[PDB]
Ligand binder design. Structure first.
Ligand SMILES: O=c1ccn([C@@H]2O[C@H](COP(=O)(O)OP(=O)(O)O)[C@@H](O)[C@H]2O)c(=O)[nH]1
Ligand SMILES: [Mn+2]
Ligand SMILES: [Mn+2]
Length: 269
């Protein structure tokens, strides 16, 4: 079976409880995770140890908090007490865990399922070939010996409009924002990097990225996490918003792909 789970945010107990609910069995089943494995919840260290141990039985995409953790580890960014990352950062296997983490994808595609996963979704300004190329470019910088330079370079809110002519720092920043920070778009598809509210509460003329017809969404189902204020609701057919806010006192959500059956684990918080 194929299971997809939204943002875990260090909620190790809820993750394991949900996987036990569906009798997740590596070798028979595959788990997709939308990223943001770490921060806020108490168990980022246990989450990373477990997910890394799954090997080929898990298909991860990196989220914005995963990248922030990598920036803290590399001395690029300051640790915020609220993130509850110190046990992971101080662990004896931190290097092993974080060098594995930075090598994980930004984008997962299963052609037989016609299923695409990214942390924030797929901007309607991208077709599939472009999304693939952009994921490969950023994955290349993150897996390289010089990844602290990219992590420093990623921070920024501009440019917010895709063009194949984008180059250099702006290109990398857009790619990072599209995969890991996207929520709202302007009518022309340009990213808004400020509004984090639910679709009903956003200022006009902002619309969710998935409300704008895009070439990937016309051919593929898209699963994503990230947007907790969406509460997993309000999406069109073929769009699966899996982040139901577990670390916020919401729930952890698991979707089984074969029958589109949902399983939910209440937050312990
Ligand atoms: C609230 O909503 C904001 C966005 O939370 P979410 O988990 O949706 O996404 P992220 O923090 O990754 O932008 C945070 O400032 C919380 O304090
Ligand atoms: Mn998140
Ligand atoms: Mn996120």
């Amino acid at each position: 079976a194929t299971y997809l789970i939204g943002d875990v945010h260090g909620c190790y107990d809820e993750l394991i409880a949900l996987l036990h609910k569906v009798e997740f069995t590596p070798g028979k089943d595959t788990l997709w995770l939308t990223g943001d494995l770490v921060a806020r919840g108490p168990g980022s260290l246990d989450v990373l140890r477990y997910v890394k141990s799954l090997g080929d039985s898990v298909r991860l995409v990196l989220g914005n908090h995963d990248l922030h953790l990598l920036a803290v580890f590399a001395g690029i960014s300051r640790n915020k007490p609220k993130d509850r990352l110190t046990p992971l950062l101080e662990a004896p296997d931190a290097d092993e865990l974080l060098n594995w983490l930075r090598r994980q994808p930004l984008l997962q595609i299963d052609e037989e399922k016609k299923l695409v996963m990214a942390h924030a979704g797929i901007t309607p300004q991208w077709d599939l070939q472009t999304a693939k190329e952009c994921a490969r470019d950023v994955e290349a910088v993150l897996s390289s010996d010089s990844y602290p330079f990219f992590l420093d370079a990623m921070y920024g809110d501009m440019p917010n409009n895709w063009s194949p002519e984008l180059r250099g720092l702006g290109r990398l920043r857009f790619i990072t924002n599209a995969f890991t920070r996207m929520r709202f778009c302007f009518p022309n598809g340009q990213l808004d990097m400020y509004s984090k509210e639910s679709p009903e509460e956003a200022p006009a003329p902002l619309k969710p990225w998935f409300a704008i017809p895009g070439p990937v969404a016309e051919e593929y189902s898209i699963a994503f996490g990230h947007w907790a204020s969406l509460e997993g609701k309000g999406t069109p057919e073929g769009i699966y918003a899996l982040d139901t806010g577990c670390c916020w006192g919401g729930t952890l959500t698991c979707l089984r792909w074969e029958d589109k059956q949902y399983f939910v684990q209440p937050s312990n918080r």
